[PDB]
Amino acid sequence: QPPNILLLLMDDMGWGDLGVYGEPSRETPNLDRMAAEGLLFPNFYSANPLASPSRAALLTGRLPIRNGFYTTNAHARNAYTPQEIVGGIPDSEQLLPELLKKAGYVSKIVGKWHLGHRPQFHPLKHGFDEWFGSPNCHFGPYDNKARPNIPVYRDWEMVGRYYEEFPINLKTGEANLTQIYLQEALDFIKRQARHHPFFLYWAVDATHAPVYASKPFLGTSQRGRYGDAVREIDDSIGKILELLQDLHVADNTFVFFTSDNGAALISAPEQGGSNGPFLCGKQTTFEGGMREPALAWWPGHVTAGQVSHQLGSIMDLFTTSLALAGLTPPSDRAIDGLNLLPTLLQGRLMDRPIFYYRGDTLMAATLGQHKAHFWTWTNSWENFRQGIDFCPGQNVSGVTTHNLEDHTKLPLIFHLGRDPGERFPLSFASAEYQEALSRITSVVQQHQEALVPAQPQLNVCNWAVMNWAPPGCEKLGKCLTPPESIPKKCLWSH
Amino acid sequence: QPPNILLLLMDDMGWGDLGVYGEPSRETPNLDRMAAEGLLFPNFYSANPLASPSRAALLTGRLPIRNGFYTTNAHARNAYTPQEIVGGIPDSEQLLPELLKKAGYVSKIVGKWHLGHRPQFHPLKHGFDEWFGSPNCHFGPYDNKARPNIPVYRDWEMVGRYYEEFPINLKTGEANLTQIYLQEALDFIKRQARHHPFFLYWAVDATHAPVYASKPFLGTSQRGRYGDAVREIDDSIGKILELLQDLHVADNTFVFFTSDNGAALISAPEQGGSNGPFLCGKQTTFEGGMREPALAWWPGHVTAGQVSHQLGSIMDLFTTSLALAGLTPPSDRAIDGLNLLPTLLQGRLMDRPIFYYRGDTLMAATLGQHKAHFWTWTNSWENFRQGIDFCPGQNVSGVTTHNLEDHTKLPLIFHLGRDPGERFPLSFASAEYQEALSRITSVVQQHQEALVPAQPQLNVCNWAVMNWAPPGCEKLGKCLTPPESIPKKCLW
Ligand SMILES: *[C@@H]1O[C@H](CO)[C@@H](O)[C@H](O)[C@H]1NC(C)=O
Ligand SMILES: *[C@@H]1O[C@H](CO)[C@@H](O)[C@H](O)[C@H]1NC(C)=O
Ligand SMILES: *[C@@H]1O[C@H](CO)[C@@H](O)[C@H](O)[C@H]1NC(C)=O
Ligand SMILES: *[C@@H]1O[C@H](CO)[C@@H](O)[C@H](O)[C@H]1NC(C)=O
Ligand SMILES: [Ca+2]
Ligand SMILES: [Ca+2]
């Protein structure tokens, strides 16, 4: 029997958020114990500076420019799947839970989907057998006229809406959702163990603004409300790992912990995390925006308490999971995700590139110790003056710019080992620069020459496609009348 | 027999420099193992933003404002003990090794002293039995006419100078000094074990610019030359701890690892370290400047792999070390250092203040989770425009200022748990501010009212008092003719 696969994907948790990663308050004892019992990656990356594209990248093993999860409305624009998005995960894309049933896996998603809320994009049409969670974020409350409250699903149908059946108290921070998500995880593990190999995709979002926690966790953290949620998630993960040992299935269960993008610094200090020593955060292709905590745990197989400097990608979880299943990735398409099993089980290292996209633009690329920025951007001057700062307290001259800066002729290159905070660009005249420039540009142009970008899914929005009347609304008496509208170009970043 | 005391004090190593503290390259496996076998402090502080005052503070258990290691030449100015300094540690201060002598200890300093280079300030006049190292930094090379190359001592006499008998190659970064310092430590431990309780003050300085490492460590770090030095020091520390275990004296040996101030960000990225998530570094009273890595290791006594959020001071090593020897601190004077043994052995927490001084000025104070800045300063506008940046890549509005800013009447208060990088001052109108303000001001007032500052030791410099002719130069033929000069006010 192939090993069970458990993917713990956090929302907006940064590289500096775990005790073992250097968080000063040391409030993640369970994750620290996971690290001590497994392998830790200090050089691990997501696939985009925000939620939806990274989640799509995880589930396809493919960059958002291949899987369609980007916009072309303007250059280097972050896009995702809000309630009004017309597109979503195309039928042409092959998702991990779809492929895993070739080895008899039963798959469940717990938490946030973000690959499209419309009927054709439902997770149960894309490989998952079970679902408890929302297709969208947990923002609200809405007035149900300008936009509807966001639905929570069980499998095919909604069981309620956020701020209705699923209360989130914005004054106090109280919500029971992480406890519900935990119980959904445990119930599924118990039902599947010694019956079918299982894949659990545990995509919680308590750490995404507005942040929440169950009452016993509120006010327990030295990091305010954000820390409260982290302690609750850490505790929950502890109980998940304990269940696997109690059912004597731990040694046949591979568990990976990571996050979908960097800490949301616009929400710091009370509602957002830390990116440790790294520059900026969510929305940017600086290290703080795409470098993530990443732990692997598989007792009797992954040697305990080790560290690997393998350049890792969230997309590698696709290809690695297939390898654990005894399966092969699709052969009719580019697959960016690499098989990490030699790294995980034998301590091997693979010389691979990490490409950093923002929308339609390859902003940066890392090979070995070096990173070249072909483009730089934080956010526009207009947004910055309105108080939106992606890099609070931070300013690196000619690097953190409010204009989309074209460095394609002379890439800004950093040595990440010597300069994790991207503070000191290499001299253009140096031998080290020339070597790095030729090595990285070679790999980038090979990538681009082989790339035929997918059509963008995130260009079009429609007021009428919001969650007015999700399936299951009728019986609950919760259907809302949609407004009259036409599809139109989404307005990004504003 | 009281337990052995081993204090490992780094020069310019930051909070973000150890793997276990979050350094991404994870290049300190021996120190990480020390942490796993002992106790880690995430909230530990030095006593000043630079070398000499912090070292004076360690060995006296007393703030620089009390022990004399500050200047009054101007307000809030960093001062230390360069070669031209006239003063140094006064006879009136009681140093740790002086006081340990009572209990049968034999004490050795290995490495950098920095408490005065003149004959009356010699460490062997101040409680140490043995010495291998230098009174000063390892800057050079000098021409031996305008400045003399810095001497290295064995006990009472110089055995050579840096860039002469003790080469430091600035082109490559090669020097054997850390290996020599390791050997000095090992030899001392072998000699004292089963004979006398030992106190070893191991004060290496390879991580201080200009950074150096022995050949086998050069080019081995992903952090460049600074990282090479760190790897060597880490390796040396592993060998020290292994010796204590191999001699079967580990269980009777208390060892502490810390640093004297934050990373020197003027020397980064090649010759300076990391302060992790904290603001600025060396020379400032922001967290990056005075928050330090801190490990305690005492097998069988300190429970392995634990973390304590005890607000700790480098000064505490004075009082704690006395408590280890079964001794009480001086009773005729204020002592800032606290006995940390109940923390170390029983896991206790003491509600103590951390005061942050820069020169003659109390810049900031931390109580619990809150830090109040009464004054802010990085460096002057003139120095900044000349390329000196204590906070590269960093700018916090109204916080990181190039003027010495008076906030005495409305302190900038930060919640350190929520905001380690001191990015978000608390609103002056909040209830949290008001509570923190009253709590912190109370303890600051109590401190200031009971304080009579010592006369400053770091005001006066004299060209003629530099190391022209250290004791031992005559037999070596290394005495240099000094210039003519008069004592004058130092330029800080
Ligand atoms: C959370 O769950 C507990 C039961 O465990 C219940 O008493 C409480 O009302 C719930 N709170 C909310 C806000 O739903
Ligand atoms: C960042 O620093 C540069 C160089 O000193 C300066 O010109 C610029 O104004 C700074 N940017 C901001 C937003 O303060
Ligand atoms: C360091 O010592 C080795 C022998 O152990 C010697 O070959 C080398 O020249 C020495 N280097 C310096 C700079 O003293
Ligand atoms: C720091 O930020 C403030 C406020 O934006 C600005 O006035 C100042 O120019 C900045 N300083 C530098 C060196 O960038
Ligand atoms: Ca996210
Ligand atoms: Ca120092």
Cβ separation A24–B277 shorter than 8 A: yes
| Residue of B389, B397, B399, B423 with the most ligand 4 atoms within 8 Å of its CB, for mutation | B397
Of B213, B227, B221, B173, nearest to B17 by C-alpha is B227
Do B386 and B314 share a domain, yes or no?
Answer: no
- The encoded tokens of residue B391 equal 């906070």
Do A273 and A159 share a domain, yes or no?
Answer: yes
Q: Which residues of B touch A268 (CB under 8 A)?
A: 419, 423-424
Q: How far apart are CA B381 and CA B110, in angstroms?
A: 39
Cβ separation A417–B224 shorter than 8 A: yes
Q: How far apart are CA B329 and CA B284, in angstroms?
A: 30
Domain carrying residue A14? 1-352+453-494
Residue B58, Cβ neighbours under 10 Å: how many? 27
The structure was resolved experimentally with X-ray
Cβ separation A418–B16 shorter than 8 A: no
Work out how many CB contacts closer than 8 A connect A with B: 108
Do A65 and A150 share a domain, yes or no?
Answer: yes
CA dihedral B90, B96, B99, B102 (to 10 degrees): -140
* A344 φ/ψ angles, rounded to the nearest 5 degrees: -65, -40
Q: Helix, strand or coil for residue B110?
A: strand
Q: Which residues of B touch A22 (CB under 8 A)?
A: 16, 21-23, 276-277
Cβ separation B393–A423 shorter than 8 A: yes
Question: What is the A207 CA–ligand 6 centroid distance (Å)?
Answer: 39
CA dihedral A8, A11, A12, A16 (to 10 degrees): -20
The CATH number given to whatever domain includes residue B184 is: 3.40.720.10
Q: Resolution of this PDB entry, in A?
A: 2.2
Which residue is closest in CA terms to ligand 3's atom 2? B176
Which residue is closest in CA terms to ligand 1's atom 4? A176
Q: What is the DSSP string of B25-61?
A: T---HHHHHHHHTSEE-SSEE-SSSSHHHHHHHHHHT
* Beta-carbon contacts of residue A438 (< 8 Å; ≥ 6 apart): none
CB contact B269 to A (< 8 Å): yes
- The encoded tokens of residue B301 equal 């006594």
Report yes or no: A161 and A152 within 8 Å, Cβ to Cβ.
yes
Report yes or no: B384 and A383 within 8 Å, Cβ to Cβ.
no
Nearest to B223 among A16, A270, A418 (CB): A418
* Beta-carbon contacts of residue B392 (< 8 Å; ≥ 6 apart): A423, A424, B265, B268
Of the residues A37, A423, A426, the best mutation for testing chain B's interface (the one with the most B CB atoms within 10 Å of its CB) is: A423
Report yes or no: B79 and B490 within 8 Å, Cβ to Cβ.
yes
Report yes or no: A208 and A111 within 8 Å, Cβ to Cβ.
no
Which atom of ligand 2 is the closest one to the Cα of A402?
A: 13
Number of separate domains in chain A? 2
Nearest CA in chain A to B368: A222
CA dihedral A265, A266, A271, A272 (to 10 degrees): -10
Nearest to B424 among A16, A221, A269 (CB): A269
Q: How far apart are CA A151 and CA A134, in angstroms?
A: 6
Nearest-Cα distance to chain A for B480, in Å, is: 41
Which atom of ligand 1 is the closest one to the Cα of A169?
A: 13
| Residue of B176, B178, B183, B212 with the most ligand 3 atoms within 8 Å of its CB, for mutation | B176
- Report which secondary-structure segment, H or E, holds B295: strand B295-297
| Residue of A395, A399, A400 with the most ligand 2 atoms within 8 Å of its CB, for mutation | A395
Place of tokens 């004791």: B471
Question: What is the B434 CA–ligand 4 centroid distance (Å)?
Answer: 28
- The encoded tokens of residue B5 equal 């005391």
Report yes or no: A15 and A276 within 8 Å, Cβ to Cβ.
yes
Q: How far apart are CA A94 and CA A101, in angstroms?
A: 12
Decide: B165 in ligand 3 pocket, CB within 6 A: no
Q: How far apart are CA A271 and CA B198, in angstroms?
A: 50
Do A214 and A249 share a domain, yes or no?
Answer: yes
Do A170 and A248 share a domain, yes or no?
Answer: yes
Residue A194, Cβ neighbours under 10 Å: how many? 9
* Beta-carbon contacts of residue B128 (< 8 Å; ≥ 6 apart): B97, B107, B108, B109, B201
* B5 φ/ψ angles, rounded to the nearest 5 degrees: -120, 120
Q: Ligand 2 — pocket residues by CB below 6 A? A: A 395, 397; B 395
Do B333 and B424 share a domain, yes or no?
Answer: no
* Beta-carbon contacts of residue A348 (< 8 Å; ≥ 6 apart): A342
Strands (E), A227-316: 253-259, 294-297, 306-307, 312-313
Cβ separation A394–B393 shorter than 8 A: yes
Nearest-Cα distance to chain B for A401, in Å, is: 12
Report yes or no: B95 and B320 within 8 Å, Cβ to Cβ.
no
- The encoded tokens of residue B190 equal 């072998």
Nearest-Cα distance to chain A for B399, in Å, is: 10
Residue A403, Cβ neighbours under 10 Å: how many? 10
Q: How far apart are CA B260 and CA B44, in angstroms?
A: 11
CB contact B420 to A (< 8 Å): yes
Give bridge partners of residue B199 from the DSSP assignment: B5, B107
Of A22, A397, A399, A44, nearest to B14 by C-alpha is A22
Question: What is the A178 CA–ligand 1 centroid distance (Å)?
Answer: 12
Do B442 and B459 share a domain, yes or no?
Answer: no
Place of tokens 């195309």: A90
Half-sphere exposure for B136 (CA within 13 Å, toward CB): 21
* Beta-carbon contacts of residue B430 (< 8 Å; ≥ 6 apart): none
Report yes or no: B43 and B317 within 8 Å, Cβ to Cβ.
no
Cβ separation A42–B25 shorter than 8 A: yes
Q: Which residues of B touch A396 (CB under 8 A)?
A: 393
Report yes or no: B119 and B88 within 8 Å, Cβ to Cβ.
no
Q: What is the DSSP string of B419-437?
A: -TT---PPPTTSHHHHHHH
CB contact A223 to B (< 8 Å): yes
Half-sphere exposure for A56 (CA within 13 Å, toward CB): 32
Q: Ligand 4 — pocket residues by CB below 6 A? A: A 395; B 395, 397
- The encoded tokens of residue B193 equal 């074990």
Radius of gyration of chain B (CA): 21
Q: How far apart are CA B2 and CA B106, in angstroms?
A: 12
Of A308, A315, A307, nearest to A290 by C-alpha is A315
* Beta-carbon contacts of residue A458 (< 8 Å; ≥ 6 apart): A52, A68, A69, A70, A71, A79, A80, A81, A85, A87, A490
Nearest to B417 among A223, A276, A422 (CB): A223
Helix axes B29-36, B224-246, angle to 10 degrees: 50
Place of tokens 């009777």: B252
Do B121 and B164 share a domain, yes or no?
Answer: yes
Nearest-Cα distance to chain A for B24, in Å, is: 6
Cα separation values, A492 from A285, A400, B332, Å: 17, 21, 69
Region of A275 (left: φ > 0; alpha: ψ -120 to 50; beta: rest) is: alpha
* Beta-carbon contacts of residue B21 (< 8 Å; ≥ 6 apart): A22, B15, B276, B293
Nearest to B22 among A43, A276, A421 (CB): A276
Region of A167 (left: φ > 0; alpha: ψ -120 to 50; beta: rest) is: beta
Strand B151-154 vs strand A253-259: parallel, antiparallel, or unpaired?
Answer: unpaired
Question: What is the A395 CA–ligand 2 centroid distance (Å)?
Answer: 7
Cα separation values, A442 from A47, A76, A353, A371, B262, Å: 20, 22, 11, 13, 40
Q: How far apart are CA A127 and CA A111, in angstroms?
A: 16
Do B389 and B489 share a domain, yes or no?
Answer: no
Cβ separation B417–A224 shorter than 8 A: yes
- Report which secondary-structure segment, H or E, holds A186: helix A177-192
Q: How far apart are CA B289 and CA B264, in angstroms?
A: 8
Q: Which residues of A touch B25 (CB under 8 A)?
A: 42, 309, 417
| Residue of A397, A401, A402, A403 with the most ligand 2 atoms within 8 Å of its CB, for mutation | A397
Place of tokens 């340990």: B100
Q: What is the DSSP string of B173-232?
A: -B--HHHHHHHHHHHHHHHHTTTS-EEEEEE--TTSSSP-B-GGGTT--TTHHHHHHHHH
Q: Which residues of A touch B19 (CB under 8 A)?
A: 307
Do B191 and B244 share a domain, yes or no?
Answer: yes
Which amino acid does the sequence have at A72? T
- The encoded tokens of residue A87 equal 């597109």
- The encoded tokens of residue A249 equal 């299935």
Nearest-Cα distance to chain A for B54, in Å, is: 23
Which residue is closest in CA terms to ligand 4's atom 1? B395
Cβ separation A268–B420 shorter than 8 A: no
Q: How far apart are CA B479 and CA B353, in angstroms?
A: 48
Report yes or no: B42 and B289 within 8 Å, Cβ to Cβ.
no
Q: Helix, strand or coil for residue A179?
A: helix
Of B82, B166, B162, B89, nearest to B120 by C-alpha is B89
The CATH number given to whatever domain includes residue A403 is: 3.30.1120.10
Q: How far apart are CA A168 and CA A152, in angstroms?
A: 13
On the 0-12 / 13-18 / 19+ scale of CB atoms within 10 A, A460 is: middle
Q: How far apart are CA A290 and CA A268, in angstroms?
A: 17
Do A203 and A322 share a domain, yes or no?
Answer: yes
CB contact A430 to B (< 8 Å): no
Cβ separation B420–A274 shorter than 8 A: yes
Nearest to B418 among A269, A392, A418 (CB): A269
Residue A27, Cβ neighbours under 10 Å: how many? 21
Place of tokens 């935990």: A182
CA dihedral B72, B75, B80, B81 (to 10 degrees): -30
Do A464 and A365 share a domain, yes or no?
Answer: no
